[PDB]
Amino acid sequence: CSDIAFLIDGSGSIIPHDFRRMKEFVSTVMEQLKKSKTLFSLMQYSEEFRIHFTFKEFQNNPNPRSLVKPITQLLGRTHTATGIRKVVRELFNITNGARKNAFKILVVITDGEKFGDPLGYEDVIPEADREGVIRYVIGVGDAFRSEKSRQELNTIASKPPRDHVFQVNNFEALKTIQNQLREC
Ligand SMILES: [Mg+2]
Numbered sequence: 001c002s003d004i005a006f007l008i009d010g011s012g013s014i015i016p017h018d019f020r021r022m023k024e025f026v027s028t029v030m031e032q033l034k035k036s037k038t039l040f041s042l043m044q045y046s047e048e049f050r051i052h053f054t055f056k057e058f059q060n061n062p063n064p065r066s067l068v069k070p071i072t073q074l075l076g077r078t079h080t081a082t083g084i085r086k087v088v089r090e091l092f093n094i095t096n097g098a099r100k101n102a103f104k105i106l107v108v109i110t111d112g113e114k115f116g117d118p119l120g121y122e123d124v125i126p127e128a129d130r131e132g133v134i135r136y137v138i139g140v141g142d143a144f145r146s147e148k149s150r151q152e153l154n155t156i157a158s159k160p161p162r163d164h165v166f167q168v169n170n171f172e173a174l175k176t177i178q179n180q181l182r183e184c
Pocket of ligand 1: 071
């Protein structure tokens with residue numbers, strides 16, 4: 001019915017506390033969303049990308065705390081745009097777990113400063129929409145302490161961005177995610 005994927009910033013700019021904080025957020029979403037009708041996938045990124053768990057793997061073993069805890073920080077650059085592309089092409093993939101007719105929800109968590117990425121958001125956002133991927137953005141660290149970084153959130157996130165962008169310690173994001181699921 002609804003396939004939700006997480007793309008988390010593992011870049012060296014994300015501070016440790018905040019990496020732990022991100023992980024925290026993901027589990028909380030996964031917890032409150034006691035499937036029966038929802039699968040999750042997740043990937044972290046640097047200049048490199050890691051698939052920590054796929055819809056299949058989440059389906060085989062749907063234990064939150066047991067899928068997230070392992071995940072350690074990659075560090076390095078921030079290839080968010082390529083992260084976006086790779087998430088729709090690899091995670092929202094049927095040979096990896098994705099379903100048909102199900103809604104696609106991409107949750108991207110980051111500080112909002114892409115760096116070193118060859119791709120600009122204008123190279124992946126269109127394909128996101130063509131593929132129907134709804135995007136939410138959870139900004140962490142210095143995400144909101146900068147105008148250039150705030151605009152990065154708006155760029156990534158689906159419209160209206162006010163309904164798809166929250167600071168990680170704003171617990172409306174969870175509330176809004178539960179809503180997004182009753183308004184399909
Ligand atoms: Mg994680």
